[PDB]
């Protein structure tokens, strides 16, 4: 039969979203982790995050797509079996603009900039999971140069995106009955915007910028969202150990 | 050992150049032809040329590149063994500007536009190898719309690129002794610009625009170049039967 194939770096933002979509849609893929346990210079996966995560690539028989966003879209378009769950509304529906908006909003964030801003400029992190011995190595080894001003700017922009999200989630909470199917950001169905939000929050925690953005009575609906998605079966299967620096 | 892998459409301009580079550099790859012998609608490979040729993808252990030009560059950069022949001059050399210039010159051509301009607007072709039954199917089935003016414009631009090439080849002929190692476009070494020129000319013949551009005393040095490269072992191994509509 025509088989799905994927070549990816397990510890990569792109691959994380793609694999989560493959699991949400119940699709069976032949995932191949191409990442090395240790680099030529014996850099673990966390010290290697600076290195490009290598955009993933899907091979569906004859078709070939190589980009997280594109591969995700292709999976949605090609697998239309009634059993396969859909992670997007119908184009005609009045949901699609909102869903796509928030997906883009969260996909526009410069995660690559953050990942380098915690290794560097580590004072802006809180409870970062990246070993500090990587900071010194990167700082001395020497992409955009290190400007605390720049890093502080994009993090203030991250606050804006997450503030919008927090508002929408609060609206969801007000609408839903206490005892009832709790909805996600856009609706009761797990959308593509939810896979972006979920992976974003998870990576942010690895960087330590999570505590600053939500917690201790800040963005409470966002805090609840994160604890909820951490328990989801799909999340713990794909992204479960992706933040553990020991497992690699 | 770290192995090379490639997923490609045998009858695709991109894959043709890449596979030719892999052969010129003597590298061993695990090429996988993903193209189908016949489509879902039973369209042979030539009637399927309209369909995107699917950019190829190289997987070198941990590294992943998915674009003809990029994959070619990567192969040049990563395989630096003395045995591996180099298809480019040294960056410092005064050759590199010229070589890269002609490579870009020939890579800028809109081959995708030509491939659709011969199926459509077939009067501009001469001895086209595409069965004419594909023309009628495409013309009625209905990317940029069909304007004879547009097609005639880009073909006049193709004449300019090939006229430059013809001039450079004439200079090569004047420099070289009759009895001596005949040089290619840029020098005695087979460059990346030569793989572009070679595959370009070969595809053009499949489209029928070859006769118009060279032949019968027109661009004689270019005609000689084409007959010469057709005999090259690397060419007949990779691109040998890529223009034969029977072999598929």
Residue numbers in the entry:
A (entry chain A), B (entry chain A): 23 to 164, 197 to 302
What does the published report state?
Here, we describe the biochemical and structural properties of the Finnish founding CMT2K mutation H123R and CMT2K‐linked R120W, both of which are autosomal dominant mutations. The disease variant proteins retain close to normal structure and solution behavior, but both present a significant decrease in thermal stability. Using GDAP1 variant crystal structures, we identify a side‐chain interaction network between helices ⍺3, ⍺6, and ⍺7, which is affected by CMT mutations, as well as a hinge in the long helix ⍺6, which is linked to structural flexibility.
Charcot–Marie–Tooth disease (CMT) is the most common inherited peripheral polyneuropathy in humans, and its different subtypes are linked to mutations in dozens of different genes. Mutations in ganglioside‐induced differentiation‐associated protein 1 (GDAP1) cause two types of CMT, demyelinating CMT4A and axonal CMT2K. The GDAP1‐linked CMT genotypes are mainly missense point mutations. Structural analysis of GDAP1 indicates that CMT may arise from disruption of specific intra‐ and intermolecular interaction networks, leading to alterations in GDAP1 structure and stability, and, eventually, insufficient motor and sensory neuron function.
